[PDB]
Structure formats: structure tokens, C-alpha cells
Amino acid sequence: NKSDAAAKQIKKLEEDFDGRIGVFAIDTGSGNTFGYRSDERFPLCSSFKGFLAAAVLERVQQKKLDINQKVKYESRDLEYHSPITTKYKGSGMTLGDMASAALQYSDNGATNIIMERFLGGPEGMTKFMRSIGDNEFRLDRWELELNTAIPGDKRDTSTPKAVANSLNKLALGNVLNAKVKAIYQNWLKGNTTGDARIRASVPADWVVGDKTGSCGAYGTANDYAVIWPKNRAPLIVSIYTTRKSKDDKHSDKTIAEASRIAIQAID
Numbered sequence: 001n002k003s004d005a006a007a008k009q010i011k012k013l014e015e016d017f018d019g020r021i022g023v024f025a026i027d028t029g030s031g032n033t034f035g036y037r038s039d040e041r042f043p044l045c046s047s048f049k050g051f052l053a054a055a056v057l058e059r060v061q062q063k064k065l066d067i068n069q070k071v072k073y074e075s076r077d078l079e080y081h082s083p084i085t086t087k088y089k090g091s092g093m094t095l096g097d098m099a100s101a102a103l104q105y106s107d108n109g110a111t112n113i114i115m116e117r118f119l120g121g122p123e124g125m126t127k128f129m130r131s132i133g134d135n136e137f138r139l140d141r142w143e144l145e146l147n148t149a150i151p152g153d154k155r156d157t158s159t160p161k162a163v164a165n166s167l168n169k170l171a172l173g174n175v176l177n178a179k180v181k182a183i184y185q186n187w188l189k190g191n192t193t194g195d196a197r198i199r200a201s202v203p204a205d206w207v208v209g210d211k212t213g214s215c216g217a218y219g220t221a222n223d224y225a226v227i228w229p230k231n232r233a234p235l236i237v238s239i240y241t242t243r244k245s246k247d248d249k250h251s252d253k254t255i256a257e258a259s260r261i262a263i264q265a266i267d
């Protein structure tokens, strides 16, 4: 019943802001889950950048790449919203800093460079998700064209449930070795763009690692987090939204609230 009540609250919140919310959460202590439109597709937006950095980390671990190798791009025309890669244009960045800037600042130059040189483009990114058992995720386009968020368009989309599964496998489970997972965890922990989202839904001294996305169209935004409450097993929370009209603005507060409802449903 607390599951049907959660469904009722999400449905109310979605009407309130005139759009669509998808949620999936997991309590990794009990195995309790809650899903709302958890099999429907939503645009990823910048959110795939958290998986892109996990792909880099897997390559480093297979000794295919070196986390300290310098990545040079002195002549690149930097895509919009390259706040980090812009400052270091002149000197390069390590592979590790560039991957973590894609994650933590949603840096588009970081994103595109890594896809061109290390990951084999949107299809390599998709292929990496297949390699961990994610059949839902697809990436088709590059930054920034992947942000179009057109209603009914499948390109560059996933489901809340698949995103949750994937983050669980990557953040908590077995794809990354001990030393490497710690690195990815700390990357997610120092994410800077998620204070108004999942982090806002949780007590002050819970530790949160997350990655956001903001399409800038169709009021499309999202966040996924790994949550360590005090002295308790971690939670996985995945929250995706879209809005009816092209010029709608995203809703951070709706995301935080959808998180609050989700977290209650699994508790």
C-alpha cells in the first residue's frame, strides 16, 4: 500500500507541474524496490556522463589507458559548457581529470573528446552499457545535439530502472575493482551540479554521489544518486523528468520531491 501511495504522490506531482516523472529506487539492505513509469524512456541529457567516466575507469583498469596520460586539445573549438576544459586548453588535462570534469561539471568538451578518442563515439558508449547488461540505454548523437529531448524520440534515452540497475552495478557492484570503484565513488561524491536535486531530498549528514542532466528543452532534467545514510545499507535513486512544451523550464524542486517520495517508498 505504501507503494500505491507513493505512486499516487508521484502522479500528483507530475500533474502539478504538467509533465512526466519516472523513478526507480532500491534499498540495497532489504532489496526493496519502488518504480513509477520505470520502464518508460526519458532523455539522458548530461546524465550519461556518469557512465562515460565509468567506461574510462574500466579502460584504465584493463590497462588499455593510463589515468595520468596527458590529453591535448590546444586547437579544439570547445563546445558550449566546457567550464573546465576551457581553463586548461593551453596545457592539456590528465585522462582522469578530463573524465571527472565530464562527471562533476557536466563539461561537454571533456565529454566529446573522450568519446572521439577513447570510447568509440555514441556507439562505443552504448556498447559499454551492453557490456554491463544494460539493454535499455542508447546514445546516438554527440554533445550538444543529443539534448533535443523531442517527445516520442528514442534517440539518447534510457529507462529509470535501467539507469538505476547500471549505477548499482558500477557504483556498488562488480565491474570495477576495489581501488577503481573507490575512485568512481569519490568522483560521484564531488559532483557539483546536484545540490538542488537528490541531495536536497536527504538528511544533512548522509553522503551522496550523483550525476545530473539538464537538456534545456522540454523542461527535461534528471539525477541519479548512490546514497549512504548513517549506519545503513546504500540506496539507489534514479529520477527522470520531461515536460509538455518545448519552452518549459526544468524543475529541480520536483526532482527533489520525487526523490523524497521514492526514498520513503523503499524505507
Ligand SMILES: *[B@@]1([O])OC2=C([C]=[C]C(F)=C2C([O])=O)[C]2[C][C]21
Residues within 6 Å of the ligand: 045, 046, 047, 081, 105, 106, 147, 193, 211, 212, 213, 214, 215, 216
Ligand atoms: B547536460 O545535459 O547537463 C548540464 C549542462 C550544463 C550544466 C548542468 F548543470 C548540467 C547538468 O544538470 O548536469 C549541459 C547541458 C549538458
Ligand SMILES: [Cl-]
Residues within 6 Å of the ligand: 103, 104, 105, 106, 191, 192, 193, 194, 211, 212
Ligand atoms: Cl554533473
Ligand SMILES: [Cl-]
Residues within 6 Å of the ligand: 042, 043, 148, 149, 150, 153, 154, 155, 156, 157
Ligand atoms: Cl531524446
Ligand SMILES: [Cl-]
Residues within 6 Å of the ligand: 194, 195, 196, 197, 198, 199, 200, 208, 210, 223, 225
Ligand atoms: Cl543530487
Ligand SMILES: [Cl-]
Residues within 6 Å of the ligand: 219, 220, 221, 241, 242, 243, 249, 250, 251, 252, 254
Ligand atoms: Cl523538470
